[PDB]
Amino acid sequence: DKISHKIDIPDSAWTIGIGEKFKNAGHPNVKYPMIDDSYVQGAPLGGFGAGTIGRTYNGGFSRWHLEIGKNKYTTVYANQFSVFQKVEGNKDGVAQVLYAGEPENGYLSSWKWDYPKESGMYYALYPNSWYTYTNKDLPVQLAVKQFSPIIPYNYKETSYPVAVFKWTAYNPTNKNVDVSIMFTWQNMIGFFGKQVNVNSGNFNKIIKDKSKDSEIVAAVMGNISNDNEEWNGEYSIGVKKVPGVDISYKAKFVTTGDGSDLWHEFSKNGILDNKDDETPTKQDGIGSAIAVNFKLQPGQTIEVPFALSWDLPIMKFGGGDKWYKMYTKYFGKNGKNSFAILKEALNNYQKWEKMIDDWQKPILSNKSKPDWYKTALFNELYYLADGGTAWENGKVGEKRTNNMFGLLECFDYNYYETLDVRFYGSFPLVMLWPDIEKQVMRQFADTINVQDSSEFKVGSNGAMAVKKVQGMIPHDLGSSYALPWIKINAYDWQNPNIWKDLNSKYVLLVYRDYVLTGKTDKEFLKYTWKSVKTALDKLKEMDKDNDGIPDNEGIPDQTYDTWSMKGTSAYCGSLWLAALKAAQEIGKVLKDNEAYIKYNEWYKIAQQNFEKELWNGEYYNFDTESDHKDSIMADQLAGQWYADILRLGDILPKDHVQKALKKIYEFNVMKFENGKMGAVNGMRPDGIVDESDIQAQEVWTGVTYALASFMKYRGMTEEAYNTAYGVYKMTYDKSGKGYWFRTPEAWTKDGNYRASMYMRPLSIWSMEV
Ligand SMILES: OC[C@H]1NC[C@H](O)[C@@H](O)[C@@H]1O
Ligand SMILES: [Ca+2]
């Protein structure tokens, strides 16, 4: 490996061998079918709301999130990089697809598949990833850096449906070597969204953009139809000429044949026929190819950029609504702009790389932080792009000031912006894209007084309940299978209109977003104030026994939606205390004296009773009335965690908080599989896991990172990082369960999981407040 030093991969990149088998992989631990796409994953490509494409560590374009809100794992075999090399003085060269696998059927049988093991590495530090190719039969070593311009405080390039592939090639040998790199791509119009005739009308064209000191050559893969539908648009691949390289192309090869129409050309001398052909297809799948060819002398290096774009301007949800995607603001809505997007990337990728370096540098250059922590911090962000992210620029056939946004809870539980989860998972948005975060919160503010008296069947017990009650914050802003932003509360396992955490979490999120954006946005506080007061006043009505605290009803009436709470719980009770303190402060800022006094009075009463009811001398009891009310809950002081972040001071005595956190570390972490797997949710005082519900026996990745944050800002530094390390280990390490780029909600002690690709572990960014 002499290519590593010609490129700059950070030491904190996650790494794996190309073609590496992983033996320890976890699987779902639930009864009903659950997504399990295997451990063959990678960092995704694509901006926010663009649809993303997961290219795996084996090189395949395999995890397709282009249909917004859906996860489709299938390798499109035509989509590849391939290499040809010939040593000067030899009769024949060698050609190889850079994919550690082969097709399942006979399509593309002529291509050279099965890139060998032990011949290259994959590296990832989101939004960047890299492949190195160090193969004994390829004298010239290659590497590629691939990325999309995901940039904090940037709402433009961050939205783009584009990826850059910056290749580096180096000849360490003493002979001249002829080298070609070829990008192939299937015309994927009709891959989703088209009910019949899926390839019909697909056609490919070549664009040659020649200016001074510039040549880009690109294939545009589209359809003859000008229909404005979800399935229609264009894909483009292309390359920018650099000194010392020639470009060749093939506009049309058949993907549903043996591939030899293309491969016979490439495998001979690495040079394609330059045959244009715009003839549309009927049944056959078609693709395009763009190649570069160059000669490397001994010791010579060359860099060449390729790119990929996709202009699919319309997203459609299962309820019928069609929206334009955010990037259309910048490139247009007609679905004929893939070349413009590609050209922007090819002409500006060097600036984008520097912008990414500029935002990663503060963390990467802090040598007090271990590299494993940096691996997790950056790579967990894959979810902001990969979480079915929807970001609208208008409803089809209708202009407003804002662009509504939503991130899925996950794909198995297909709900946008689940609020009890975003309480944990929204940290990267407030920290790094605060204009999105505030937009999401204003969306919630607007729903507070919505009433929908239609009824749904509650899944957990079969009872009928009202869909949306006035004054109760919704669980979610809909499902991609139905109508995101329009039909809220798609969740039906429990009735969220009686949850005891949603209204308080809402208030806490509002105040968080003011505090973490500099305490300057009074306008955001003004927009949300009525909803905040309404939320607290409605939750106060759920105090059945006049202790000043909402009562859990002996059912799962909060985020732990199979774990029953009864009476005053540490979790919902501490959230309530913190939300009251936050509202007091907002009242002061907005000069609403009567709100300040009222919430101050509720706070003093609730605080005294919480302490009396739950403090046991060592920690806060789980609750006041449950069968295992003395269980040690990992999240028992969630309200105090948030109060620390919001700078609201002590809601509970410092001594008791410290005692409680030390107990959690000593028990829920250290007596759970040696502290190597995170904090288990519930532990009995005798040091064995609480078995009253599956959720008590689970480690929640997002809860655990949040607890690590809580510990860190309370000065328990070793405990904080040791607690977080188990999550990192299980997710990324060789000794883990193979969850890289699909961090789940939960695992049990056997390491098996529930709900891969989950929003909650984005809470790791609360460790960087
Ligand atoms: O895993 C628990 C999780 N299930 C799915 C629900 O949408 C969410 O509110 C809850 O926290
Ligand atoms: Ca009460």
From TrEMBL:
Domain Glycosyl-hydrolase family 116 N-terminal, chain residue ranges per copy: 42-352
Keyword Metal-binding listed: yes
E.C. code: 3.2.1.45
Keywords: Calcium, Glycosidase, Hydrolase, Metal-binding
GO biological process, one term: glucosylceramide catabolic process
A GO cellular-component term linked to this record: membrane
SUPFAM superfamilies, sorted: Six-hairpin glycosidases
Annotated ranges, domain Glycosyl-hydrolase family 116 catalytic region: 405-767
UniProt KW Calcium keyword: yes
Residues binding Ca(2+): D543, D545, D547, I549, D551
GO terms assigned for molecular function: beta-glucosidase activity; glucosylceramidase activity; metal ion binding
TM helices/strands, residue ranges: none
Domain of life: Bacteria
Matches recorded under PANTHER family: BILE ACID BETA-GLUCOSIDASE-RELATED, NON-LYSOSOMAL GLUCOSYLCERAMIDASE
Protein name: Glucosylceramidase
